[PDB]
Amino acid sequence: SSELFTLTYGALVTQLCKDYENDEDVNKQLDRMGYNIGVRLIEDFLARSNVGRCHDFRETADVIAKVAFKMYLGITPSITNWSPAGDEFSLILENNPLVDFVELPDNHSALIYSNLLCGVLRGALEMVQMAVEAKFVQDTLKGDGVTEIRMRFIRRIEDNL
Amino acid sequence: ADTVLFEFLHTEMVAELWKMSLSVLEGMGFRVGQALGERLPRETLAFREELDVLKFLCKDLWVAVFQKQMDSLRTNHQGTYVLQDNSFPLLLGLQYLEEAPKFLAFTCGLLRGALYTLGIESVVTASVAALPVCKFQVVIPK
Numbered sequence A: 001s002s003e004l005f006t007l008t009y010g011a012l013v014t015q016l017c018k019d020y021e022n023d024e025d026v027n028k029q030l031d032r033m034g035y036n037i038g039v040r041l042i043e044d045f046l047a048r049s050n051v052g053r054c055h056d057f058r059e060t061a062d063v064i065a066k067v068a069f070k071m072y073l074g075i076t077p078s079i080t081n082w083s084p085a086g087d088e089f090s091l092i093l094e095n096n097p098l099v100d101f102v103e104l105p106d107n108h109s110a111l112i113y114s115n116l117l118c119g120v121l122r123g124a125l126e127m128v129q130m131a132v133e134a135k136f137v138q139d140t141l142k143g144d145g146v147t148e149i150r151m152r153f154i155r156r157i158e159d160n161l
Numbered sequence B: 001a002d003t004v005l006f007e008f009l010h011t012e013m014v015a016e017l018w019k020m021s022l023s024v025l026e027g028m029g030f031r032v033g034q035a036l037g038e039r040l041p042r043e044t045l046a047f048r049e050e051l052d053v054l055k056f057l058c059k060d061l062w063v064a065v066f067q068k069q070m071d072s073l074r075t076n077h078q079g080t081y082v083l084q085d086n087s088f089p090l091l092l093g094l095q096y097l098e099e100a101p102k103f104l105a106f107t108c109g110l111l112r113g114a115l116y117t118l119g120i121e122s123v124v125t126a127s128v129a130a131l132p133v134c135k136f137q138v139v140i141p142k
């Protein structure tokens, strides 16, 4: 009965939507919360896999898609749409990873249901000196044929010092 | 989803959704508890006395949610029960004794929500002995 995470995340979105009249405020909160979870998740991940430090953005994609996702969500997103420079790629999923159904009529058109994941991705990667942008550019819950998360390498974060 | 994910999410929820706040956390746990009970072998409790329902929560529900059974169950046989987890998972120094209540609210709802699905009305509160020992108090009015 490991549907605990899904049910719990569902209640959080429902509760944040009542606490904030504006959906943009929910997306912002979901992203910050995700970031905070992301910083913790990275430690847990490296400790359980020992994959090592990546060097290219291409290596990061294979670890995130073939190892991280499989370990935490039991799924393997596909990697496509690489930029000629290799500083951007997309994660393709059959459906929304965090949510199965949404309440109708649609009162949250601008609401990014699983925005937490994007924060998790950004927070985890920031811990490994990579400033990246994770963003849903396609979502099955939005009517799209697939769920697509675009990953963009912004810059290399300087060491703490 | 992986076990650790729930704890990560729960920790952030307590921080962000920081007594009306506890009411909110408990309220959320209540809806989740309802759905979870719904997926457990509810049928088996048909024709059973209240006592078995609470054992159900200590075993069937606690395993499903925390991958472990309750460490002990006590009762006054007058509708009140005390469930004890000697090492509660969501509790990841004496300085935190006052903060612990915040991390137990959601689970109180979880328990209350599960009881609801089984047709039982109740009030659930929690307290901490010596961290990480937690006692959940279930009160079934009658």
Ligand SMILES: *C(=O)CCCCCCCCCCCCCCC
Pocket (backbone or CB within 6 Å): A041, A042, A045, A051, A052, A053, A054, A055, A059, A060, A063, A064, A068, A069, A072, A073, A116, A117, A120, A121, A124, A125, A128, B005
């Ligand atoms: C190379 O430098 C190794 C980097 C590995 C980064 C792993 C980041 C974890 C991705 C999290 C995805 C899990 C989904 C969890 C949903 C909340």
